[PDB]
Amino acid sequence: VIAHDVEPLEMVVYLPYLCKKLQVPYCIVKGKARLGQLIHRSTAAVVAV
Amino acid sequence: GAYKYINALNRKKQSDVLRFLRRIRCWELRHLPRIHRVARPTNPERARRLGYKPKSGFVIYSVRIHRGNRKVSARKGIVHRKPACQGIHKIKRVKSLQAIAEQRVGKHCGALRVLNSYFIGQDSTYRFFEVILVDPFNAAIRNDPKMNWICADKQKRREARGLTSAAKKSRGFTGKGRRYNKIGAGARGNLKRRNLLQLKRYRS
Amino acid sequence: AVSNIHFCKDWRSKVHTWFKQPFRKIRRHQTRVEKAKAVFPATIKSLKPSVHCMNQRFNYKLRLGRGFTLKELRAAKIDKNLARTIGIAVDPRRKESSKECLNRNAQRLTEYMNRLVVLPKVHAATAKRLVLNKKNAEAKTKKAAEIKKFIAEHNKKTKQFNKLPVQQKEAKQVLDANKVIRLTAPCTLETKTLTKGMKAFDAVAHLRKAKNVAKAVSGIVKGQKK
Amino acid sequence: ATRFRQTRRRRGHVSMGYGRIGKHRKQRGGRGNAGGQHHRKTWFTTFHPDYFGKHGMRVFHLKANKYYCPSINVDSLWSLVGKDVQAQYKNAKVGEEVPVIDCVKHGYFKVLGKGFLPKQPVIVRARYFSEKAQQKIKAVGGACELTA
Amino acid sequence: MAGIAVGLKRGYPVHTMTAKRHYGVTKRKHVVNDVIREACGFSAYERHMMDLLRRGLDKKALKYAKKHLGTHKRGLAKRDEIQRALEAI
RNA sequence: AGAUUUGAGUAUCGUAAGAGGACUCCCUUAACUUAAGCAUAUCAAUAAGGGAAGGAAGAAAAAAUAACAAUGAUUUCUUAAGUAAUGGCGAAUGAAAAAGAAAAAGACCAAGUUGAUA
């Protein structure tokens, strides 16, 4: 799961293209603060399952 | 490792993705003040390489500098010189724009130490760098055995003496050997040593 | 004679006088003495290899180098981690030039290791190494029996590392170890038996054949492509 | 010794030995080797007739160690070991033991042939040999050895 | 006794002894290169070089590459690297 | 409303400034002078102008030499050497490896890996 509002965008831009090559399912949600609440932090760039 | 992809991605600066993002960043820095603090580095891969650590006492400053060349500062372009020195245009600064920008940031923030700097972008007029600065009087920096070298007295205004990587390259310290015979341990110190006329106490 | 004198520049600011020379001796000698009093092993000017000089103008002479290669320590059965602690210079940057260099500098380390007397890390007689030597002293004697025997009869796996010579002795303080282990033995007058083949060996033709062979490689390559 | 100069003997003479018609002025034709082709051409023609010009090929970086080759003639070979050893092996021939002269050990690389050798066999060890050097060593009953 | 100081077989007789270590890359660089190339694409001169290669002007693709890279050997690698992209497509 | 990002005001504890600059590291395109004129060159990293340092500073651990019977961080001294080379090839300018000594010391980040992850 990749946040859409990560700044700078250069840190997660390759993740869709890397996951596309390895056939790893990936989704992009809205809010790096929403992800951070899952892991009890202010923000969270990416979360995997 | 995430940062082995960012480094590979950052080498494709002519790609559409990086060109568009640099366009937005270069536009934004054209309106903000010339020297100002940014919250986090815009190139964390390159910032981490040059010594930035996300800890207290490490700050990032953005500086905008007018790239290109400038005329020789003589009134109305009039110099009372021989035709060998009668050039006004086409003369280039010895120090790189990165070294010049590092000194402007260091002068602005006299109480911090310039660690290193890198390149953000450029346009037809400006070039934007980012300067990694360290507070030498932070308790974290003082107590770090791997970093408290920056708390030495001799490191006061590093960039103005020529100790940073950007300012050391403009001194000629980019390699070793027969190509760098005149920049052995300092270009001006080397010349003084060779020109010394040694007069021993007992001489013929 | 046509004069070439470079005094057109301000030599008066380039003049360096040596009035401090008689006081450099006193400074350096006194500091050299002070280091010896502090830790006398330190001023020993740790042992160094016997490496040839560069170029054919000097290649027959030997001079002290910097540091033994990691292969020379292995050959002499010394750990590279312990080597720096007992006054041995170590230079990982040195590529082993030849087998002769490897053997010659392996003798230098072995000879130095025999003259070495390492004091115990703790001066008390209750030190573990001194105690350990007592505990296995019985095994040393039986070990020293079989080694002394198959040596005495003869005249592929060996120890990786030897033992550090550790004991308690009087402190005979020697200021350097390079002047105890000479680089080159004194050269006597060499002398040989004259044989019929020696009289017949034509040195000049060998020199010119060796030279002319090197100058005909171009003729070989040029005629090949035709 | 400033008391032995000519200045002390010319006190009282007005011009100090420099002439009245032509004074001792600052210059006498330029500073240094000035006018090498205009008014001092007769000096350079007379005393350095090849000063101006070019000759030979440039060596951008000359490796002066590759031209190092000390030389010794045949007559001077025995001086390396001295007359004491030379007389000791004066009555030797082929079959028995003969002294070896190590020119390289003494710093001599090439052996040239000049002068006359003593009429005794000898073994000469060196890096290079002249044609006449080997002839004179062989004509006396000796052998030549290469090195390096 | 001693060798000879002239020629190919030159030098004092000794047993000279190093390894020409290859500074290479692992098998994961192929994945990294493929990932970045998809996310980035090709530059203006790489795009212009692909067009020339398609028409069969291999020499013009090398002359163009040498112009934009400055080295004959670097131009050859880019020409081969680009033509490998065409074969995959 | 709440979760973040970014930017400010205020309070607390600190930090820079100025003096000195003999020695140290640098920026800048002086001219007088020499070339028997003079315009490249020389004077010359020289003068003046400007910045930054400490009791020393600078440099320092090979993308280094060499072509050897090979060496091995930096610095300083001897020699190479008024030599290779540069130059209206004129006036003039001008190194470095080898070799001999003083002293000797090597360690880190980044990237990679470990993730009930701190």
Place this chain on the structure above:
RNA sequence: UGGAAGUAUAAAUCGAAAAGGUGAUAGUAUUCAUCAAAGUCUAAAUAUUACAGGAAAACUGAUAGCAAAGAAGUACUGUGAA
């Protein structure tokens, strides 16, 4: 710059890598040798005519030696730098 078909730096444009740099005559190829750039630190050997404290001298001995052997950068001059 001694570095000569470019030794070093900078600017405009261009811009790499399944690595590569150097072997100082430009170019291509094949071998060989030797290193592994584009981040940081690091004592010792070295310099010194600021200034402070000392010791010496084939130095000067009141027109000499620092400008200054006394309330010397003082008296005095200039709008001022001096």
Place this chain on the structure above:
RNA sequence: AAAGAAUUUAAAACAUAUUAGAUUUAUCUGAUGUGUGAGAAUUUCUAGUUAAUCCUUUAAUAAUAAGGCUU
């Protein structure tokens, strides 16, 4: 056709085979193995044939280029 002993012990580059792992990409990574590279022929000379042949660009060659020497 004629004279010729050649110097003497601590070894790594890998050209590789053969296996133990991993990989799909211009695919790599260890270890086992032999030779290589090993040392207790070479030169001269006469008649052929082939080739090269004014010197240099300093690790070795090549075709271009450049520099030398004489006029």
